[PDB]
């Protein structure tokens, strides 16, 4: 049954396995419930004059921040970040969602959706040791359509940003997005006056990884249409995962999701982005190709 078939998916998901989430669909809910770890946010977006945004507050029941928000979606806009539970992993707002629209991972499941801003970035910063025995947290970046999530770790703590634009901007994400990117991280490891001027592009932002963090993944979307988007640089610490590659899938989207686990006292991190395809209706989706990753 769904009520018997969600508890077992938690069980997985308490006991650190990730698998329980490979190859069914995005996790994304517009849903706004408090949760118990703490954790910081912040912002980065390119408008005119620019804005940026720190919080080190806790996300309440009923009621998103309009900091990180997006009205220029939907009869009212939609959240930008938010907290929920797993008793309702993806809604109706989600559509590469499937598997996750009739079944769940419990309340007891708490999940942090990071999407990208306007025109800029959101991110996260969470300590592994926040998380509590039994209560599995995951970090969701939404349904991934041509935008760059970044997973990273330093010193105990878990760093998720994520960045791209909601308009069609050509070259947006590659480049601008990549400075928005770089300046929440910035903002987030303890420099309140980030200047990162040079030349931007996806190469800038692995050797920044590679500079400031042990370990890190990136999810993007590789096309030679927009050549700033190619990575051309290798570090040994910077894991990279192209989920849209040159018109292909023409149609689909991507997926990356971060599991932080206390497993017999012990906080484990897995990170699992994914690449789909959608029909013409978006009415079924089919896995194209998987990065699974510890940190």
């Known amino acids: 049954s769904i009520?018997?078939?969600?508890?077992?998916?938690?069980?997985?998901?308490?006991?650190?396995?990730?698998?329980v989430l490979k190859g069914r669909g995005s996790i994304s809910?517009?849903?706004?419930?408090?949760?118990?770890?703490?954790?910081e946010a912040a912002n980065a977006d390119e408008q005119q004059p620019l804005f940026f945004y720190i919080k080190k507050d806790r996300f309440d029941n009923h009621g998103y921040d309009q900091y990180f928000y997006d009205n220029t979606v939907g009869p009212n806009g939609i959240p930008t970040l938010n907290t929920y539970t797993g008793e309702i992993p993806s809604d109706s707002s989600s559509l590469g969602s499937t598997y996750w629209k009739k079944y769940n991972l419990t309340n007891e499941t708490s999940i942090?959706?990071?999407?990208?801003?306007?025109?800029?970035?959101?991110?996260?910063?969470?300590a592994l040791e926040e998380v509590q025995e039994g209560k599995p947290v995951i970090i969701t970046s939404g349904n991934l359509s041509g935008c760059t999530t970044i997973v990273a770790r330093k010193e105990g703590y878990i760093y998720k940003v994520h960045?791209?634009?909601?308009?069609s901007l050509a070259g947006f994400t590659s480049t601008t997005g990549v400075k928005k990117a770089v300046e929440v991280l910035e903002l987030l490891t303890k420099e309140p006056i980030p200047r990162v001027e040079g030349i931007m592009s996806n190469d800038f932002l692995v050797d920044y990884l590679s500079e400031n963090f042990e370990d890190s993944l990136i999810t993007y979307s590789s096309s030679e249409k927009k050549p700033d988007s190619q990575i051309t640089i290798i570090r040994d610490n910077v894991s990279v995962f192209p989920y849209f590659l040159?018109?292909?899938?023409?149609?689909?989207?991507?997926?990356?999701?971060?599991?932080?686990?206390?497993?017999?006292?012990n906080v484990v991190v897995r990170s699992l982005?994914?690449?789909?395809?959608?029909?013409?209706?978006?009415?079924?989706?089919?896995?194209?190709?998987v990065f699974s990753k510890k940190f």
């Open 3 to 19: 009520e018997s078939t969600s508890k077992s998916n938690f069980q997985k998901l308490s006991r650190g396995n990730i698998d």
């Open 112 to 126: 942090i959706r990071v999407s990208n801003s306007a025109r800029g970035a959101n991110g996260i910063k969470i």
């Open 246 to 265: 040159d018109n292909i899938p023409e149609h689909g989207f991507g997926t990356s999701a971060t599991v932080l686990v206390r497993v017999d006292g």
């Open 163 to 167: 960045t791209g634009t909601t308009k």
């Open 29 to 39: 809910s517009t849903r706004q419930r408090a949760i118990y770890p703490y954790f």
């Open 273 to 289: 982005s994914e690449s789909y395809s959608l029909n013409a209706d978006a009415s079924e989706i089919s896995v194209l190709k």
